[PDB]
Design a protein around this ligand. Structure first.
Ligand SMILES: O=N[O-]
Ligand SMILES: O=N[O-]
Ligand SMILES: O=N[O-]
Ligand SMILES: [Cu+2]
Ligand SMILES: [Cu+2]
Ligand code: NI
Length: 308
């Protein structure tokens, strides 16, 4: 957790492997619930694989950490408030660290592909400070990332499901945000999932639908720590399957309508489905921002409507 100083952020591990430490540049937050961000350009231009993550966080002050891969970080320089954004392009989430929900490891043989022609060129670290009650001292919290240039037999990726058009009228008891897309790639295997909502979300659920049958991928209270939780049973999604997600929102407590957006007063319905694929079939990211089968949600399991 200590700042690195003279030895810097790159530690050789083996002939082909190295650790990259992505830390805050000795920051001292002034308010509670501060969101700090920073970027590291990858040290290698060629293709590499992220096979492990080690959290390096002060247990007193850090609420959560997020690590992203992208090509255009929102800001240049040393560090910034993530109120100005994380990445200008698509931020590909790699890792979440929650205080009250310790992370689960990548399965062995699984890595994210980064760098090269098409991979992420930058890491962006987001650190959410909770208490900030310490003393006035400098903080260097972050993540140690294990990189290798040995190709991995299985490639990790992210299937992101997000609402874009949700409107939650003020005081409205239940507002559903439904998301659905047909899967049209090679088989992916879901091993982890993360849900994200702001203060109005009560339950988020995602399913694979295969010939009318709903198989649960993940279902979580978004007010609980937003870590990646492992899937109960590894769920394969194959060509012709439908991915379906529902967030349940309340409008109660709000004087005005709440829509999708980036601030605390806005909402989000995000479901991050972390998968692996065979390397020769793999693609690193997919997104569903649509609702292609809206009448299919008539047979959605009851669990998706009651809170956990
Ligand atoms: O039931 N969707 O294949
Ligand atoms: O992915 N079929 O077990
Ligand atoms: O979750 N704030 O965009
Ligand atoms: Cu947090
Ligand atoms: Cu959000
Ligand atoms: Ni399988």
């Amino acid at each position: 957790n200590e700042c690195l100083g003279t030895i810097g952020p790159v530690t050789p591990l083996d002939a082909s492997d190295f650790a990259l430490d992505i830390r805050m540049p000795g920051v001292t937050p002034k308010e509670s619930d501060t969101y700090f961000c920073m970027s590291m350009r990858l040290p290698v231009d060629e293709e590499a694989f992220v096979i492990d993550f080690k959290p390096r966080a002060s247990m007193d002050t850090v609420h959560h950490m997020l690590l992203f891969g992208c090509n255009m970080p929102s800001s240049t320089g040393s560090y910034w408030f993530c109120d100005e954004g994380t990445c200008t392009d698509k931020a590909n989430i790699l890792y979440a660290w929650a205080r009250n929900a310790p992370p689960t490891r990548l399965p062995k043989g699984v890595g994210f592909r980064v760098g090269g022609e098409t991979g992420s060129k930058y890491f962006v670290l987001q650190v959410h400070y909770g208490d900030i009650s310490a003393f006035n001292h400098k903080d260097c919290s972050g993540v140690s990332v294990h990189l290798t240039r040995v190709p991995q037999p299985l490639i990790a990726g992210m299937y992101l499901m997000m609402s874009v058009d949700t409107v939650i009228p003020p005081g409205e008891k239940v507002v559903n945000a439904d998301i659905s897309c047909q899967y049209k790639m090679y088989p992916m295997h879901v091993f982890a999932y993360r849900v994200h909502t702001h203060h109005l979300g009560k339950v988020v659920s995602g399913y694979r639908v295969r010939n009318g049958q709903w198989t649960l991928i993940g279902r979580q209270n978004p007010q609980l720590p937003q870590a990646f939780y492992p899937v109960e049973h590894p769920v394969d999604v194959t060509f012709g399957d439908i991915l379906a997600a529902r967030c349940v929102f309340t409008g109660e407590g709000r004087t005005e309508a709440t829509h999708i957006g980036g601030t605390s007063s806005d909402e989000m319905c995000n479901l991050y489905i972390m998968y692996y694929m065979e390397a020769k079939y793999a693609l690193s990211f997919m997104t569903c921002t649509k609702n292609v089968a809206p009448d299919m949600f008539r047979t959605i399991p009851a669990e998706a409507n009651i809170p956990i």
